Amino acid sequence: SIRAEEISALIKQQIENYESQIQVSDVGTVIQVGDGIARAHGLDNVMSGELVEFANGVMGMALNLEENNVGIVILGPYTGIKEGDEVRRTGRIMEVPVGEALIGRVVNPLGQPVDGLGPVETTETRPIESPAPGVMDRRSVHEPLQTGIKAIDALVPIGRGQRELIIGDRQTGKTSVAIDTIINQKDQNMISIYVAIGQKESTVRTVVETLRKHGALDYTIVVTASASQPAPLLFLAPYAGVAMGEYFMYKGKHVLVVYDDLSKQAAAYRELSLLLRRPPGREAYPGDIFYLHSRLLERAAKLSDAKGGGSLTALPFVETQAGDISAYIPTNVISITDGQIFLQSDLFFSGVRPAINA
Amino acid sequence: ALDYTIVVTASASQPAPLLFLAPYAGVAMGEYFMYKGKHVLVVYDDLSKQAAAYRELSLLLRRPPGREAYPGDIFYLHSRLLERAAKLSDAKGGGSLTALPFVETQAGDISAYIPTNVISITDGQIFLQSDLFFSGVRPAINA
Amino acid sequence: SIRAEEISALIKQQIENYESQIQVSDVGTVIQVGDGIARAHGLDNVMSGELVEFANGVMGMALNLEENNVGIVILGPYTGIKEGDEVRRTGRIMEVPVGEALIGRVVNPLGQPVDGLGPVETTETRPIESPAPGVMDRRSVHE
Amino acid sequence: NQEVIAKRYASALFQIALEQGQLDRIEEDVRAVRQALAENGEFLSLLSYPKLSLDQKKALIAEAFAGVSTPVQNTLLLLLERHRFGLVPELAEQFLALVDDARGIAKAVAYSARPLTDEELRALSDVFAQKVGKQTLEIENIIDPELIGGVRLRIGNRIYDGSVSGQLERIRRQL
Amino acid sequence: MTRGRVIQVMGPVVDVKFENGHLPAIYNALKIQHKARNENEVDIDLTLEVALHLGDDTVRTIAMASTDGLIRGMEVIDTGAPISVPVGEVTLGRVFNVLGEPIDLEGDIPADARRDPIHRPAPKFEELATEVEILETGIKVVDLLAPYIKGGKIGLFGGAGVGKTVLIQELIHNIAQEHGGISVFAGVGERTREGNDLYHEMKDSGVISKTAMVFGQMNEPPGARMRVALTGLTMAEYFRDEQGQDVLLFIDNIFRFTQAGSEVSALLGRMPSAVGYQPTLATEMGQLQERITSTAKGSITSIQAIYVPADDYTDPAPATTFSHLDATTNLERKLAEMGIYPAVDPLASTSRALA
Amino acid sequence: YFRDEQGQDVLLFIDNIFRFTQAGSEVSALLGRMPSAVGYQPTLATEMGQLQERITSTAKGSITSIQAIYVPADDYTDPAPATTFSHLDATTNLERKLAEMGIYPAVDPLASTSRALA
Amino acid sequence: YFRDEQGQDVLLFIDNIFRFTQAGSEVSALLGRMPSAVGYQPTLATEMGQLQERITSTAKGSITSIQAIYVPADDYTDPAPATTFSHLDATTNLERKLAEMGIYPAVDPLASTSRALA
Amino acid sequence: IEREKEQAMAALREQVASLSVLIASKVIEKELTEQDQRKLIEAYIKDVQEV
Numbered sequence A: 001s002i003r004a005e006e007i008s009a010l011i012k013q014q015i016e017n018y019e020s021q022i023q024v025s026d027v028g029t030v031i032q033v034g035d036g037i038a039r040a041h042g043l044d045n046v047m048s049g050e051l052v053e054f055a056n057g058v059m060g061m062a063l064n065l066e067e068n069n070v071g072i073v074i075l076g077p078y079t080g081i082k083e084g085d086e087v088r089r090t091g092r093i094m095e096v097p098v099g100e101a102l103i104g105r106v107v108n109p110l111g112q113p114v115d116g117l118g119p120v121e122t123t124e125t126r127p128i129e130s131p132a133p134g135v136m137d138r139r140s141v142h143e144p145l146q147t148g149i150k151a152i153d154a155l156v157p158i159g160r161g162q163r164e165l166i167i168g169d170r171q172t173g174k175t176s177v178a179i180d181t182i183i184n185q186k187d188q189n190m191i192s193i194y195v196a197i198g199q200k201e202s203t204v205r206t207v208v209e210t211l212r213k214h215g216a217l218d219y220t221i222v223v224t225a226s227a228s229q230p231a232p233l234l235f236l237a238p239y240a241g242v243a244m245g246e247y248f249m250y251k252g253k254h255v256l257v258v259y260d261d262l263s264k265q266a267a268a269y270r271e272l273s274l275l276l277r278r279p280p281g282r283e284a285y286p287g288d289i290f291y292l293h294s295r296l297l298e299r300a301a302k303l304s305d306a307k308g309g310g311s312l313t314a315l316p317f318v319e320t321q322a323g324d325i326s327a328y329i330p331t332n333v334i335s336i337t338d339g340q341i342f343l344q345s346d347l348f349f350s351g352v353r354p355a356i357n358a
Numbered sequence B: 001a002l003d004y005t006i007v008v009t010a011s012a013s014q015p016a017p018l019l020f021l022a023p024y025a026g027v028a029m030g031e032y033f034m035y036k037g038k039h040v041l042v043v044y045d046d047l048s049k050q051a052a053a054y055r056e057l058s059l060l061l062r063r064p065p066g067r068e069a070y071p072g073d074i075f076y077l078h079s080r081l082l083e084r085a086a087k088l089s090d091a092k093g094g095g096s097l098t099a100l101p102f103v104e105t106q107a108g109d110i111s112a113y114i115p116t117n118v119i120s121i122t123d124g125q126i127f128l129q130s131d132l133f134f135s136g137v138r139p140a141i142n143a
Numbered sequence C: 001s002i003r004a005e006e007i008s009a010l011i012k013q014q015i016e017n018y019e020s021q022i023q024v025s026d027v028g029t030v031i032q033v034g035d036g037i038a039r040a041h042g043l044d045n046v047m048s049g050e051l052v053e054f055a056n057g058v059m060g061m062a063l064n065l066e067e068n069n070v071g072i073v074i075l076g077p078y079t080g081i082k083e084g085d086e087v088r089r090t091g092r093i094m095e096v097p098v099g100e101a102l103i104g105r106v107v108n109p110l111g112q113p114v115d116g117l118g119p120v121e122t123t124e125t126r127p128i129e130s131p132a133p134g135v136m137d138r139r140s141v142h143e
Numbered sequence D: 001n002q003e004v005i006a007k008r009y010a011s012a013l014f015q016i017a018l019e020q021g022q023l024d025r026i027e028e029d030v031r032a033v034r035q036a037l038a039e040n041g042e043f044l045s046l047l048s049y050p051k052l053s054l055d056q057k058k059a060l061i062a063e064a065f066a067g068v069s070t071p072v073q074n075t076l077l078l079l080l081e082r083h084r085f086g087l088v089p090e091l092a093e094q095f096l097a098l099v100d101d102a103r104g105i106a107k108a109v110a111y112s113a114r115p116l117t118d119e120e121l122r123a124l125s126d127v128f129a130q131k132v133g134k135q136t137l138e139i140e141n142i143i144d145p146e147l148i149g150g151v152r153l154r155i156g157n158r159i160y161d162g163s164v165s166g167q168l169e170r171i172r173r174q175l
Numbered sequence E: 001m002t003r004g005r006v007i008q009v010m011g012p013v014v015d016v017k018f019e020n021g022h023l024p025a026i027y028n029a030l031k032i033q034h035k036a037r038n039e040n041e042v043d044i045d046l047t048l049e050v051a052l053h054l055g056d057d058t059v060r061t062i063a064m065a066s067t068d069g070l071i072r073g074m075e076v077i078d079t080g081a082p083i084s085v086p087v088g089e090v091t092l093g094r095v096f097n098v099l100g101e102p103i104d105l106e107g108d109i110p111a112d113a114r115r116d117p118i119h120r121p122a123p124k125f126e127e128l129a130t131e132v133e134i135l136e137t138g139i140k141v142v143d144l145l146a147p148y149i150k151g152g153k154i155g156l157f158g159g160a161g162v163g164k165t166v167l168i169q170e171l172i173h174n175i176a177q178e179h180g181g182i183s184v185f186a187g188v189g190e191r192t193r194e195g196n197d198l199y200h201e202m203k204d205s206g207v208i209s210k211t212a213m214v215f216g217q218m219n220e221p222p223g224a225r226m227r228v229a230l231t232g233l234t235m236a237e238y239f240r241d242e243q244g245q246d247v248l249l250f251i252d253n254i255f256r257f258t259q260a261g262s263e264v265s266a267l268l269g270r271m272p273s274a275v276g277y278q279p280t281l282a283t284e285m286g287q288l289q290e291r292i293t294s295t296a297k298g299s300i301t302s303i304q305a306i307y308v309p310a311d312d313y314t315d316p317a318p319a320t321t322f323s324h325l326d327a328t329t330n331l332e333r334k335l336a337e338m339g340i341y342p343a344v345d346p347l348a349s350t351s352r353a354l355a
Numbered sequence F, G: 001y002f003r004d005e006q007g008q009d010v011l012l013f014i015d016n017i018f019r020f021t022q023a024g025s026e027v028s029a030l031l032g033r034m035p036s037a038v039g040y041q042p043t044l045a046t047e048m049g050q051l052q053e054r055i056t057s058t059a060k061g062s063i064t065s066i067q068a069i070y071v072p073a074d075d076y077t078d079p080a081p082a083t084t085f086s087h088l089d090a091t092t093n094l095e096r097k098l099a100e101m102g103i104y105p106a107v108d109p110l111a112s113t114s115r116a117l118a
Numbered sequence H: 001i002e003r004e005k006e007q008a009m010a011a012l013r014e015q016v017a018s019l020s021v022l023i024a025s026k027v028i029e030k031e032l033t034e035q036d037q038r039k040l041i042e043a044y045i046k047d048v049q050e051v
């Protein structure tokens, strides 16, 4: 039988022996590491969506803020991250370095230079999760986005400010249409952004080389996230592209943004949500898989004259299986984009290139 | 034929681990004569039932299930069984173990999980169609 | 999120014996009985895939080694097994009796005679989980 | 799902306190642990900190919870090494609910318009001890200016309400 | 100290607990060498690959061999690295398992040899080749109708007596003859007697002295069959990085890589993706096949067999292999009965380089 | 407000009322609910019954609601379109087979029904 | 009792043994078992065999058993009809086209098979 | 019409009845309950004791 005052004061002196040794508010320690998803004890003052930085130097995304811990999605190689590693805050919510000096560079979805031409010195950053233009913030599209392809510019015309899907099977010329419409924007006042999502990095290398041969790297930006990169970087590649495009959009200039295979982004977010043990829907894509692409593609608009008048025309790609236009991810993107351009394999293997089914 | 055979029985009233351990007792009784240089035939009547018994044990032991609630190591189970059927070299004694596993299909489909697994393990297959069995062709081997 | 080992009988003797844990290490008491599957607290030195013996003489096989219990799979009639029975580690991995004497007899997967023609007089045993002959230990099929 | 686990832990400690013969010491230690952890909430956040080793956390519990008996300290260290130290106040509530049934005492919460005398509460306990089955009964009196001119009692999960039940029963029976 | 001990064994999955701050990183190798103290124990030589961090200083691993006989409390040493697999001239003419240990009966490789890690990030954007160049094979159907690419991935559709092994073997001979490179055959999860037949065919044709063979067969756990293409690939990477030459890398039945990853995912307890495949299907296929590239100094070109299960080219494992294929060569039995050797179907075989 | 307080005829045009149930399905996994058929909330019927049984005509005023309803992956047996057939007086089922023939409006003439056709 | 004491050749009629398995699948979800393939209990083969292996002919007597089987939606591939069929030795298929013709008993001669017809 | 009369009559009745409750409580407060509180309580125990 001991007095509760004695035990209470002894617990008090044990706490105020250790109140200065520990740090919990801006510093966290990892409980679990697995499959590119950390989970860290601590970080009492972290906020939802904030960039966190591990002791390795790899960045992380704080999705969930549970009562006991913080759920961290790792934005890079997770093999250097162990239990007991220190996590510290950065103070900013999920930003990529965006500026004028990013034109002509090949960067990752975190804005870091990948082509090895040195650092990319920028002065501003824009948030990844930025709201779209409103109803009254927009304007009807009235300016031609001219591709240089006769079947597109005749039959399926694209305006400066719309969302035009380029849909088709494997090896039907989607990337060729994208590079043909990025090369044509040279003498026009257009800044291009090519986002490579889950491609082979050899093909992205040849894409950057054929953009350099035609002088297109004076106005284009390449955001690449290849197949070997983890699904968190694949998840944030098109949002990095649109956050780089919004700078020139809200400064009054016009931007083309190409998403090479958004179906790779859908499969990567499907991977990340199944590793978060979220219950899936049809074709095992989660329920958030429409909001994934609709939060992306509704951020591409034609602004009114009260907001500068700049635009953001977006060309997403969806890779279908056996020409099924009535699958789940194609009918998700068709109900988001304005038009679609269907590239048929029956015409592509018969020599009709570009194989646009009219 | 009982002068040279061994019969290992695990019936449906027996508990599921005896069903699970009957083929491993089969190879453990065959490998004795295989490594003594003799030639052994081992016959597995309905390995699909052994797969269902291991599914039962893994679900009652709360192991995480895969396709058709079979566990992740059910292909490892049948492969760890059937790869013990070998033809040894002359330094190992030259003995053999030929295996004749059986998989029972339901209304003649082989796109199910356990038939695709055991077809992908073995060195060829023999189809016994019920369409040829009904029409008079016995043995009903689809050539 | 309750654990299997949180039983007021077990928690009592671990608060009794906190400063000196009673090292059982060869004997365990059953936690849960059901469907031919027994969880048992204890058996600290039990192996995976090991033949283990209950109190009534029924054998079992230990598949899941978990953090504070053993997932024992019961190799016989389990209706006589209650909570609190002692489980005795036999010290042997699952193996069958093996020899010339098995020829012409009906055997269960444990190796016991089922004909009723008498005992099976074998000398040596071999484990049922044995590695396959390696790819340099084989020869092309020609017989 | 914490009450069913704390019931098992408290029942194990309860059987130890019965077979040892030191039930008053274990009860005083459990009350001291509950009051010390209610007065200080940062101790759970200190022992949930993962960089502290398990030997160091056992040193903190063996240093802080000194003077209490041996099975209470063994229970606290066992809850530490099983990572179930968050339910120690629930363990204290379940253990005191066990030892109140062991002594034969029951807790009740009384509401009356006026604070009753010391003899009337003993009379109510002597009436209701035969209805509940306990030998001794406890009355907790609250001022509660809502109810008028009567007493209502909630003992266990049963309410003996007769204060304002007349007016509510009347307006339910007329209309 | 970096020695912890086993807490859980459940099939091929083993949980090992270390001290705090001394856990191994993900994908490291963990060795269990145990000599039986009593008659109640089993001698154990077992190797675990770290898969997860479960918390409470524990580590969930996957096994490379059988876990039968493991005792809770048996000590586990930390190698400090992933699976170190020997590379160089000592691997040519030799047959290896997934651990980089010689299956062959001549001898073992000494401990002073260079050993490379299995898990390596793909070569950077700085290091890739800018151009697309053609891997000249000397086979007229290949060099005319379906041209191969240095750094490319090529699908073989065939097997069961059409001439896949003869085409494999002539490719090794022609590349090692003219281009000066070597080949690496990675037999991922296939029949052991067919691996024996392929070994003796490469042995008596003289082709084996210029190749390095890696076999992880069906009897091994799924955690072993998931890492066979990577441990042949890390042998090919030495010859394109330190030697700087054009290297072949054969993966017999790349579909076994996908379903072995699916089985490891089901054992690890993940929620399955569509068709029962792991959620990490596309990124495991990418982390295999983005290391098969043409860099500035060398290249790995890869001829791969694909099963196409249920004859469905829209099945997710063919649909994720095909997004990396740069050519397709189709072996037809009607041309092998006709007398045409090689039996490559001239109209069905397509290539991306034929432009 | 209009049909109750003013007693006036009201037109409701709602484009993609499927997005109501889909936005419920996106939150239901994080609300601690167990999944249901096709990944939809367990409350897929009563969340749309608290909304759609409320869009009614009364004795004060009427609401004629015209609702566009998305059909996911062109699957009319999906649980969110299948449970909203029971709420509607008249349905027009648009088909892609008729839209690809150049037939606009691509209304399936057979599967489109009404309570009025009598 | 009649088999093991009277030594008789006993009939034992089980109407719709599919219900014996689906009753087990109804109980096993509430007992706390993981669901097996097709929603059937995981212990379906053993619970079927512990019924079907007590129906044997010993040296003393015999128990033969004619068992009606309802196949749901004529799907012969779900696991509970498969494990009822794996214990069967013969089938007698009662056809409506022979009962309307006047043939009593209306056993379909071609579709009713037996293991003993050898 | 006949239903309408019967429902209005019950409703009004309920409003008067509501008023009557509110006051019943107010007036009982108004009386001096030193005598009553001891009397009531003593009766209540006795009353509880019997049921």
Ligand SMILES: Nc1ncnc2c1ncn2[C@@H]1O[C@H](COP(=O)(O)OP(=O)(O)OP(=O)(O)O)[C@@H](O)[C@H]1O
Binding pocket: A169, A170, A171, A172, A173, A174, A175, A176, A177, A319, A353, A354, E323, E352, E355
């Ligand atoms: N208009 C054209 N005329 C001639 N050749 C063309 C034309 N368009 C595309 N091609 C050729 O077709 C080949 C494949 O097209 P492309 O790679 O652009 O299709 P894809 O949809 O990007 O393929 P994947 O989906 O596999 O990335 C290219 O190598 C290109 O040379």
Ligand SMILES: [Mg+2]
Binding pocket: A174, A175, A260
């Ligand atoms: Mg492309």
